[PDB]
Amino acid sequence: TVVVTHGEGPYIVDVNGRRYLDANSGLWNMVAGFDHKGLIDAAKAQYERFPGYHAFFGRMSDQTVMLSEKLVEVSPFDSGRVFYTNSGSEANDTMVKMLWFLHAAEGKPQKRKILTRWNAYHGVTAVSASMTGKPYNSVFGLPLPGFVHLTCPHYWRYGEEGETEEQFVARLARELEETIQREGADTIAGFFAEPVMGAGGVIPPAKGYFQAILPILRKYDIPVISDEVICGFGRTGNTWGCVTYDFTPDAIISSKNLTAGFFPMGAVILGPELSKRLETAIEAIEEFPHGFTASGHPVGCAIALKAIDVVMNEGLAENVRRLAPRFEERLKHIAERPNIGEYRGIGFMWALEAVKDKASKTPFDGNLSVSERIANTCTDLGLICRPLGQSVVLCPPFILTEAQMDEMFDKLEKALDKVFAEVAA
Amino acid sequence: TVVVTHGEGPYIVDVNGRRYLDANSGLWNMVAGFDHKGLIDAAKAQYERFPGYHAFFGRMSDQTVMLSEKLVEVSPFDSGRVFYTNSGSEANDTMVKMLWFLHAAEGKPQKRKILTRWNAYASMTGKPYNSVFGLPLPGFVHLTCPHYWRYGEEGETEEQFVARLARELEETIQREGADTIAGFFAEPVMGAGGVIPPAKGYFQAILPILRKYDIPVISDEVICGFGRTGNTWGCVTYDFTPDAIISSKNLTAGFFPMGAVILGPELSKRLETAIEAIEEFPHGFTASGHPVGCAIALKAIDVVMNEGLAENVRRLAPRFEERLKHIAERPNIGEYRGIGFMWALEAVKDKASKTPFDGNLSVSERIANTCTDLGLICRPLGQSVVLCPPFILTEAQMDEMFDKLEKALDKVFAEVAAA
């Protein structure tokens, strides 16, 4: 119903000039707001320069070359190799295929299974949707065979009666051990994890989770991939979610924030060990992988170069670190409400989960659509937030000021007051 | 290793100032070349006024609605629906999921297999890593590629070959069971397969068979879409009506990543009636395409259709073929094949027996590497080299392309002989 032609800073603006503070950042990607001038100028400069091309082995744009070097620099790796795609979904599919390719070239073509977690979201294509752990995919007859979903490490939801957080983490470690021993380590191509789960509802992992599961994966030679599609470039208060949870992955998947939302592109940064192994495989078999044609775009790459520079050198990632404590403190105050079951998140990605009864964690009945009601009321009050399950998510642009932060929570709290009073009746 | 900075018309230029005629149009998509001022200005204007593009808030932008109308208009369909993705490959995937969704919603969840002609390029069993990246989705069922020169039996006519492939298709449907088959996808001319136009009369023989069974027909126009075969769609040039079209590449002339699935009337209605009957809307389908992309696609479609580029393909195609015909007189060219502005040359060590050079000699690779040295870009595929230049190519530039390619063929065939 609302006609929107553009945005201004962190606001979506309708044709009448009403401003809606956008706590979805567009599609969880507009870190620099909707009209950032340096980003817009960089997009334009590249169209005038070289508006399109495709990267091949031995032939690519100067933009591809520069962004590859910049991504290795800002990755946790001292060296590595980069390729590009059009989206996070394609980046995940291609990473999976590269592992299949690699393990097959290494004489283990049965090493195919992919481990993810329930509530993970990796994309919308057949493979990345099979990696995804959501009920809605049953309507497609997904997941495909060989996509194994581990329990989601969301302690609040999945911890058993009297189970402590430490015990929960030991149980997930046991479960991983057992899944590996049952399936057979030789048949498992890789494990992919968003450090903090995004579309699953903004779920940081229980304390110690990555510290417990990484030694296990390493023991069994199962490559570890960090999906940074949402966490990447500063949203969790370090450049990468995997830094924030101190695990060293074998490769990184990136998108969204990579271009500050101004251009659809994906990137896969391969760390030193997978790069060395791929290089040796390709050398050994004496040809380039048949059918590999993944590429981004020179305009996407130029805009990404500018996005990285803005986020890192013009104060945006720093704004997230400085405002993250005030962000959390205000959430903590909101979670005092009887109908807020918990708040969770880190950096500039958070969620609030609605409950009908706090002590027992009982949700409101599905048909009441409490999340949607909250989200609709926020829109009426000039705030946009995403309803996910029984939660509402705040993932606002990194350019958010303290005043716009207050503005966001003032509106949100007025919406919660109204919705909770109204469903109470 | 070549680092490319910019282009001009159909040429690219590297960091050292070398220029190369890019006979690949980037990779099929850059149909208007590398510095088309109308398209550049239109794409710059989108950023200048970047849309309030959102995951869920606000009405679909005017550009997106307008592209959907234009796509249905220019499609062979009288009406239908459009869904958007970031690429040809994602739209392919989306169309497959859409069929899975629809057949399950109509009560046949076992209807999942996709009929396709895809295939990979002694003492040994083969290598599993050589067909990972092309491999279609699980449940694909393979039909023989209708490449007459390659697969026709000794002394078998093109007509008999097509009749043999009609039998194959019938026999395949009977063996798998029609109730387990979700659809048939086809590129009218096969692209990554090696630029393979189908044997004369192929679609006229297989379509009636597919139509006996309710196996939706999808025309994969990611390469053939918007003029490359000398008409607006490949399916138009081979005179058939699919139930849906997959589109990608030329759609924005390479200026912006986007794909589209264009559903015809019948699949549009089945989709809508199943969305209601199941009371679930399929996740990750969207009518809301990227508005910058949608605006750039409007401009690209107008350029190609109304500023003479699709017409130039039709006009220069006979000269493209004459010259290929002449090249194919060489003892080490087994054939030329193609139509409009997509063509291939196939290298052979012995013409009469269709014997290729040993894989280890990498002959296509050598041809394409020699082309680069002489200022021409062409793409090696299997034992073939492929030409798909921008639609803006002039007759002087075509001559230039072939003069360079012929010098490459001369050098490679001699080096390889003397070896």
Coordinates of C-alpha atoms in Angstrom, one line a residue, chain B residues 19-382:
Chain B
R19 CA 43.3 -4.3 -27.4
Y20 CA 41.4 -7.5 -28.3
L21 CA 38.3 -8.1 -30.3
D22 CA 36.1 -9.8 -27.8
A23 CA 34.2 -12.4 -29.8
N24 CA 32.7 -13.8 -26.6
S25 CA 30.8 -10.6 -25.6
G26 CA 32.2 -11.0 -22.0
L27 CA 30.5 -14.3 -21.7
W28 CA 27.6 -14.2 -24.1
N29 CA 25.9 -11.2 -22.4
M30 CA 27.5 -7.9 -23.4
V31 CA 25.4 -7.7 -26.6
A32 CA 25.8 -4.0 -27.0
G33 CA 29.5 -4.0 -26.4
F34 CA 31.6 -2.3 -23.7
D35 CA 30.8 1.4 -24.1
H36 CA 27.2 1.9 -25.2
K37 CA 26.5 5.4 -24.1
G38 CA 22.6 5.0 -23.9
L39 CA 22.9 2.0 -21.5
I40 CA 25.7 3.6 -19.5
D41 CA 23.7 6.8 -19.0
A42 CA 20.6 4.9 -18.0
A43 CA 22.5 2.8 -15.4
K44 CA 24.2 5.9 -14.0
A45 CA 20.8 7.6 -13.7
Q46 CA 19.5 4.7 -11.6
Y47 CA 22.2 5.2 -9.0
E48 CA 21.8 8.9 -9.0
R49 CA 18.2 8.2 -7.9
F50 CA 18.7 4.9 -6.1
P51 CA 15.4 3.2 -5.3
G52 CA 14.0 2.6 -1.7
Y53 CA 14.5 -1.1 -2.5
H54 CA 13.4 -3.2 0.4
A55 CA 12.9 -6.8 1.4
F56 CA 9.2 -6.4 2.4
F57 CA 8.2 -2.7 2.9
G58 CA 6.4 -0.6 0.3
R59 CA 4.8 -1.3 -3.1
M60 CA 6.8 -2.8 -6.0
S61 CA 8.5 0.0 -7.9
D62 CA 7.1 1.3 -11.2
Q63 CA 10.2 -0.1 -13.1
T64 CA 9.6 -3.6 -11.9
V65 CA 5.9 -3.6 -12.8
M66 CA 6.9 -2.1 -16.2
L67 CA 9.5 -4.7 -16.9
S68 CA 7.1 -7.5 -16.0
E69 CA 4.7 -6.0 -18.6
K70 CA 7.3 -5.7 -21.2
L71 CA 8.6 -9.3 -20.7
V72 CA 5.1 -10.7 -21.1
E73 CA 4.6 -8.5 -24.1
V74 CA 7.8 -9.5 -25.8
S75 CA 7.4 -13.2 -24.8
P76 CA 5.5 -15.5 -27.2
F77 CA 2.8 -15.6 -24.5
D78 CA -0.5 -13.5 -24.5
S79 CA -0.4 -13.3 -20.7
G80 CA 1.6 -14.8 -17.8
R81 CA 3.7 -14.0 -14.7
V82 CA 7.3 -13.1 -14.0
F83 CA 9.6 -14.0 -11.2
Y84 CA 13.1 -12.5 -10.8
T85 CA 16.5 -13.7 -9.6
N86 CA 20.1 -12.5 -9.8
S87 CA 21.1 -14.7 -12.7
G88 CA 20.2 -17.2 -15.4
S89 CA 21.4 -20.0 -13.2
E90 CA 19.2 -19.0 -10.2
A91 CA 16.2 -18.7 -12.6
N92 CA 16.8 -22.2 -13.8
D93 CA 16.9 -23.4 -10.3
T94 CA 13.7 -21.4 -9.4
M95 CA 11.8 -22.9 -12.3
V96 CA 12.8 -26.4 -11.2
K97 CA 11.7 -25.7 -7.5
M98 CA 8.4 -24.2 -9.0
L99 CA 7.6 -27.5 -10.7
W100 CA 8.5 -29.5 -7.6
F101 CA 6.1 -27.2 -5.7
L102 CA 3.3 -27.4 -8.2
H103 CA 3.3 -31.2 -8.8
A104 CA 3.5 -31.8 -5.0
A105 CA 0.6 -29.3 -4.4
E106 CA -1.4 -31.2 -7.1
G107 CA -0.9 -34.5 -5.2
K108 CA 2.1 -36.0 -7.1
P109 CA 5.1 -35.4 -4.9
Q110 CA 7.0 -38.1 -6.9
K111 CA 6.9 -35.9 -10.0
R112 CA 10.4 -34.5 -9.7
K113 CA 12.7 -35.6 -12.6
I114 CA 13.8 -33.1 -15.2
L115 CA 14.3 -34.2 -18.7
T116 CA 17.5 -32.7 -20.2
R117 CA 20.1 -33.1 -22.9
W118 CA 23.1 -32.1 -20.6
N119 CA 26.3 -34.3 -20.7
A120 CA 30.0 -34.1 -19.7
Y121 CA 32.9 -33.5 -22.2
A122 CA 39.6 -46.9 -22.9
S123 CA 41.8 -48.1 -20.0
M124 CA 40.0 -45.7 -17.6
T125 CA 36.5 -45.5 -16.0
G126 CA 36.4 -41.6 -15.9
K127 CA 37.0 -38.9 -13.4
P128 CA 34.2 -37.9 -10.9
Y129 CA 35.6 -34.3 -10.5
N130 CA 35.2 -33.5 -14.3
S131 CA 31.4 -33.3 -14.1
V132 CA 30.7 -31.6 -10.7
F133 CA 30.3 -28.0 -11.8
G134 CA 27.9 -28.6 -14.7
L135 CA 26.0 -31.5 -13.0
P136 CA 22.2 -30.9 -13.1
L137 CA 20.1 -31.3 -10.0
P138 CA 19.4 -34.9 -8.6
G139 CA 16.7 -36.7 -10.6
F140 CA 17.8 -35.4 -14.0
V141 CA 17.1 -37.8 -16.8
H142 CA 19.4 -37.5 -19.9
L143 CA 18.3 -37.5 -23.5
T144 CA 20.7 -37.7 -26.4
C145 CA 21.9 -34.2 -27.6
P146 CA 20.4 -33.7 -31.1
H147 CA 23.8 -33.1 -32.7
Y148 CA 23.5 -34.9 -36.0
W149 CA 27.2 -34.7 -37.1
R150 CA 28.3 -36.2 -33.8
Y151 CA 25.6 -38.9 -32.9
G152 CA 24.0 -39.9 -36.2
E153 CA 24.8 -43.5 -37.1
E154 CA 26.9 -44.4 -40.2
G155 CA 24.7 -43.9 -43.2
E156 CA 21.7 -42.7 -41.1
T157 CA 19.9 -39.6 -42.5
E158 CA 19.1 -36.5 -40.4
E159 CA 15.4 -37.4 -40.6
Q160 CA 16.1 -40.9 -39.4
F161 CA 18.3 -39.5 -36.6
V162 CA 15.4 -37.3 -35.4
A163 CA 13.0 -40.2 -35.6
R164 CA 15.5 -42.2 -33.5
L165 CA 15.6 -39.4 -30.9
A166 CA 11.7 -39.3 -30.8
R167 CA 11.8 -43.0 -30.0
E168 CA 14.4 -42.4 -27.3
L169 CA 12.2 -39.8 -25.7
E170 CA 9.1 -42.2 -25.8
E171 CA 11.1 -45.0 -24.4
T172 CA 12.6 -42.8 -21.7
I173 CA 9.1 -41.5 -20.6
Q174 CA 7.8 -45.1 -20.5
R175 CA 10.8 -46.3 -18.5
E176 CA 10.9 -43.5 -15.8
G177 CA 7.1 -43.2 -15.7
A178 CA 5.4 -39.9 -16.8
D179 CA 4.1 -39.6 -13.2
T180 CA 7.7 -39.2 -11.9
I181 CA 8.7 -36.5 -14.6
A182 CA 8.4 -32.8 -13.5
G183 CA 9.4 -31.2 -16.8
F184 CA 11.6 -30.9 -19.9
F185 CA 14.1 -28.1 -20.2
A186 CA 15.9 -27.2 -23.4
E187 CA 18.1 -24.5 -24.8
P188 CA 16.7 -24.1 -28.4
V189 CA 20.5 -24.0 -29.4
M190 CA 22.8 -25.6 -26.7
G191 CA 25.2 -23.1 -25.3
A192 CA 27.7 -24.5 -22.9
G193 CA 27.3 -27.8 -24.6
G194 CA 29.3 -26.4 -27.6
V195 CA 26.8 -24.2 -29.6
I196 CA 24.8 -27.1 -30.9
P197 CA 21.8 -26.2 -33.1
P198 CA 19.3 -29.1 -33.0
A199 CA 18.9 -31.5 -36.0
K200 CA 16.3 -30.3 -38.6
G201 CA 12.8 -31.0 -37.4
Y202 CA 13.8 -31.9 -33.8
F203 CA 11.3 -29.8 -31.8
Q204 CA 8.6 -30.6 -34.3
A205 CA 9.1 -34.3 -33.5
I206 CA 9.7 -34.2 -29.7
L207 CA 7.1 -31.6 -28.7
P208 CA 4.0 -33.7 -29.7
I209 CA 5.4 -36.5 -27.6
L210 CA 5.9 -34.2 -24.5
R211 CA 2.4 -32.8 -25.0
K212 CA 0.8 -36.4 -24.8
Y213 CA 2.1 -36.5 -21.2
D214 CA 1.8 -33.2 -19.3
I215 CA 5.5 -32.7 -18.8
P216 CA 5.8 -28.9 -18.8
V217 CA 8.2 -27.6 -21.5
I218 CA 10.7 -24.9 -20.5
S219 CA 12.6 -23.0 -23.1
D220 CA 16.0 -22.0 -21.5
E221 CA 16.6 -18.8 -23.3
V222 CA 19.5 -17.6 -21.1
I223 CA 21.7 -17.5 -24.2
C224 CA 19.2 -17.4 -27.1
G225 CA 17.0 -14.8 -25.5
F226 CA 16.9 -11.4 -27.1
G227 CA 18.2 -12.1 -30.6
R228 CA 21.3 -14.2 -30.8
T229 CA 19.6 -16.9 -33.0
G230 CA 18.2 -14.2 -35.4
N231 CA 14.8 -13.9 -33.6
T232 CA 13.7 -12.5 -30.3
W233 CA 13.6 -16.0 -28.7
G234 CA 15.2 -19.3 -29.7
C235 CA 11.8 -21.0 -29.4
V236 CA 10.6 -18.6 -32.1
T237 CA 13.4 -19.4 -34.4
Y238 CA 12.6 -23.2 -34.0
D239 CA 8.9 -22.6 -34.1
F240 CA 7.6 -24.0 -30.8
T241 CA 5.6 -22.6 -27.9
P242 CA 7.0 -23.5 -24.4
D243 CA 5.0 -23.3 -21.1
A244 CA 7.7 -21.1 -19.6
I245 CA 10.9 -19.2 -20.5
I246 CA 14.1 -18.7 -18.5
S247 CA 16.0 -15.5 -19.2
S248 CA 19.2 -14.0 -18.0
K249 CA 22.0 -12.5 -19.9
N250 CA 21.2 -10.1 -22.7
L251 CA 18.2 -9.1 -20.6
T252 CA 20.4 -6.2 -19.2
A253 CA 23.1 -6.5 -21.9
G254 CA 25.5 -7.5 -19.2
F255 CA 25.1 -4.2 -17.2
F256 CA 23.4 -5.8 -14.2
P257 CA 22.9 -9.3 -12.7
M258 CA 19.4 -10.5 -13.2
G259 CA 17.5 -13.5 -14.3
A260 CA 13.8 -14.0 -15.0
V261 CA 11.3 -16.8 -15.2
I262 CA 8.4 -16.0 -17.4
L263 CA 5.5 -18.3 -16.9
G264 CA 2.9 -18.7 -19.6
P265 CA -0.9 -18.8 -19.1
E266 CA -1.2 -22.5 -18.1
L267 CA 1.6 -22.6 -15.5
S268 CA 0.5 -19.2 -14.2
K269 CA -3.0 -20.5 -13.4
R270 CA -1.8 -23.8 -12.0
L271 CA 0.6 -21.9 -9.8
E272 CA -2.1 -19.6 -8.5
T273 CA -4.6 -22.3 -8.0
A274 CA -2.0 -24.4 -6.1
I275 CA -0.9 -21.5 -4.0
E276 CA -4.5 -21.2 -2.8
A277 CA -5.3 -24.9 -2.5
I278 CA -2.2 -25.6 -0.4
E279 CA -2.7 -22.2 1.4
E280 CA 1.1 -21.6 1.2
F281 CA 3.0 -19.2 -0.9
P282 CA 6.4 -20.7 -2.1
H283 CA 9.3 -19.1 -0.3
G284 CA 12.0 -17.4 -2.3
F285 CA 9.8 -16.7 -5.4
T286 CA 9.5 -13.0 -6.0
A287 CA 7.7 -10.8 -8.5
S288 CA 9.7 -7.9 -7.2
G289 CA 12.9 -7.8 -9.3
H290 CA 15.8 -5.4 -8.4
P291 CA 14.5 -2.0 -9.5
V292 CA 17.9 -0.8 -10.9
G293 CA 18.1 -4.1 -12.9
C294 CA 14.6 -3.7 -14.1
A295 CA 15.2 -0.2 -15.4
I296 CA 18.5 -1.2 -17.1
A297 CA 16.6 -4.2 -18.7
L298 CA 13.9 -1.9 -20.1
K299 CA 16.7 0.1 -21.7
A300 CA 18.6 -3.0 -22.9
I301 CA 15.4 -4.5 -24.4
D302 CA 14.7 -1.3 -26.2
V303 CA 18.2 -1.0 -27.5
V304 CA 18.3 -4.5 -28.8
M305 CA 14.9 -4.6 -30.3
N306 CA 14.5 -1.0 -31.6
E307 CA 17.9 0.4 -32.2
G308 CA 18.9 -2.1 -34.8
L309 CA 21.1 -4.6 -32.9
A310 CA 18.8 -7.7 -33.3
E311 CA 18.4 -6.6 -36.9
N312 CA 22.2 -6.5 -37.4
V313 CA 22.4 -10.1 -36.2
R314 CA 19.9 -11.1 -39.0
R315 CA 21.7 -9.0 -41.5
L316 CA 25.3 -10.2 -40.9
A317 CA 24.5 -13.9 -40.2
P318 CA 24.8 -15.1 -43.8
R319 CA 28.3 -13.5 -44.1
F320 CA 29.2 -15.1 -40.7
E321 CA 28.2 -18.5 -42.2
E322 CA 29.9 -18.1 -45.6
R323 CA 33.2 -17.5 -43.9
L324 CA 32.8 -20.4 -41.5
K325 CA 31.9 -22.7 -44.4
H326 CA 35.2 -21.7 -46.1
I327 CA 37.1 -22.3 -42.8
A328 CA 35.6 -25.8 -42.6
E329 CA 37.3 -26.8 -45.8
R330 CA 40.4 -27.3 -43.6
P331 CA 41.4 -31.0 -43.0
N332 CA 41.4 -30.4 -39.2
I333 CA 38.0 -28.7 -39.0
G334 CA 35.4 -31.4 -38.6
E335 CA 32.5 -29.0 -39.0
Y336 CA 31.1 -25.5 -38.5
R337 CA 27.7 -25.2 -36.7
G338 CA 25.5 -22.3 -35.4
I339 CA 22.9 -19.7 -36.4
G340 CA 22.5 -15.9 -36.2
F341 CA 25.4 -14.7 -34.0
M342 CA 26.4 -18.0 -32.2
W343 CA 28.8 -20.4 -34.0
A344 CA 31.4 -23.0 -33.3
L345 CA 34.3 -24.7 -35.1
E346 CA 35.2 -28.3 -34.2
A347 CA 38.8 -29.4 -34.4
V348 CA 39.6 -33.0 -35.6
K349 CA 42.8 -34.9 -36.1
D350 CA 41.2 -37.2 -38.8
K351 CA 38.2 -35.8 -40.6
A352 CA 36.9 -39.0 -42.3
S353 CA 36.7 -40.9 -39.0
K354 CA 35.8 -37.8 -36.9
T355 CA 38.8 -38.6 -34.7
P356 CA 39.7 -35.7 -32.4
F357 CA 43.2 -34.8 -31.3
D358 CA 44.4 -36.4 -28.0
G359 CA 42.9 -34.6 -25.0
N360 CA 46.5 -33.9 -23.7
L361 CA 47.2 -31.8 -26.8
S362 CA 44.5 -29.3 -25.5
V363 CA 44.0 -28.1 -29.1
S364 CA 41.1 -25.7 -28.4
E365 CA 43.0 -24.2 -25.6
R366 CA 46.0 -23.6 -28.0
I367 CA 43.7 -22.1 -30.6
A368 CA 42.1 -19.7 -28.1
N369 CA 45.6 -18.8 -26.5
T370 CA 46.9 -18.1 -30.0
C371 CA 43.9 -15.9 -30.7
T372 CA 44.6 -13.9 -27.6
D373 CA 48.2 -13.3 -28.8
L374 CA 46.8 -12.0 -32.1
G375 CA 44.2 -9.7 -30.4
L376 CA 41.1 -11.9 -30.6
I377 CA 39.1 -13.4 -27.8
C378 CA 37.3 -16.6 -28.4
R379 CA 36.1 -19.4 -26.1
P380 CA 37.4 -23.0 -26.1
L381 CA 34.8 -25.7 -25.2
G382 CA 35.7 -29.4 -25.5

